[PDB]
């Protein structure tokens, strides 16, 4: 189906002393199957590797629209020195797995170990990919941390 996954808010500012932050990945259209939604933390001005934040890259399991997933990022209690440290988190191309649907099942048996599904030439590959789950239009999560940040009205 046309799956659309996006973050709650594209910018979140959190405390250094928060430990773990929580972001829900929302599904605009919904979910109906078994959808694996990968994500990856982008080191902007903040340093991963356990310095300011713990970088996290994994894949979330969105089966049905009923459930929601949360990305838990480790924010370290780092009282270093004032930086403009922020990191972004983005969602990767989500994949729809069989058995979670009804009637029509995409039996992914044509896959190539290098990277693509369509390991052939352009057999309407773009149309095939347009029939794959995607993310929202502009979906990024800029997570901002450091001693003394400004808390704006983050409201929905």
The residues, any chain, with a CB within 8 Å of residue 3's CB and separated by 6 or more, are 27, 29, 30, 31, 35, 62, 94, 96, 133, 134
Q: Is the dihedral of CA 71, 74, 79, 85 positive or negative?
A: negative
Give the Cα separation of 104 and 102 in Å (integer): 6
Q: 129: helix, coil or strand?
A: helix
Residue 4 belongs to what H/E stretch? Answer: strand 4-7
Phi–psi pair at 127, nearest 5 degrees:
-70, -35
Within 8 A by CB and 6+ apart from 92, the residues are 37, 38, 39, 40, 59, 135
How far, in Å, CA of 133 to CA of 37, rounded?
9
Q: What is the DSSP string of 82-122?
A: ----EEEEEE---EEETTSSSS---------TTS-S--SS-
H/E run at residue 127: helix 125-129
| CA pair distance 4, 52, nearest whole angstrom | 31
Which tokens is 49 given? 């590797």
| Superfamily the domain 1-156 falls into | CalX-beta domain (2.60.40.2030)
Other Cβ atoms less than 10 A from the Cβ of 155: the count is: 5
């Amino acid at each position: 189906h046309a799956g659309i996954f996006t973050f709650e808010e594209p910018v979140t500012h959190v405390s250094e002393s928060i430990g773990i932050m929580e972001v829900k990945v929302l599904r605009t259209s919904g979910a109906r199957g078994n959808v694996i939604v990968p994500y990856k933390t982008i080191e902007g001005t903040a340093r991963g590797g356990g310095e300011d934040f713990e970088d996290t890259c994994g894949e979330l399991e969105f089966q049905n629209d009923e459930i929601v997933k949360i990305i838990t990022i480790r924010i370290f209690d780092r009282e270093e020195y004032e930086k403009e440290c922020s990191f972004s988190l983005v969602l990767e191309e989500p994949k729809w797995i069989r058995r979670g649907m009804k009637g029509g099942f995409t039996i992914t048996e044509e896959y190539d170990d290098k990277q693509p599904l369509t390991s052939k030439e352009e057999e309407e590959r773009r149309i095939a990919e347009m029939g794959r789950p995607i993310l929202g239009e502009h979906t990024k999560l800029e997570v901002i941390i450091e001693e003394s940040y400004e808390f704006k009205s983050t409201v929905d």
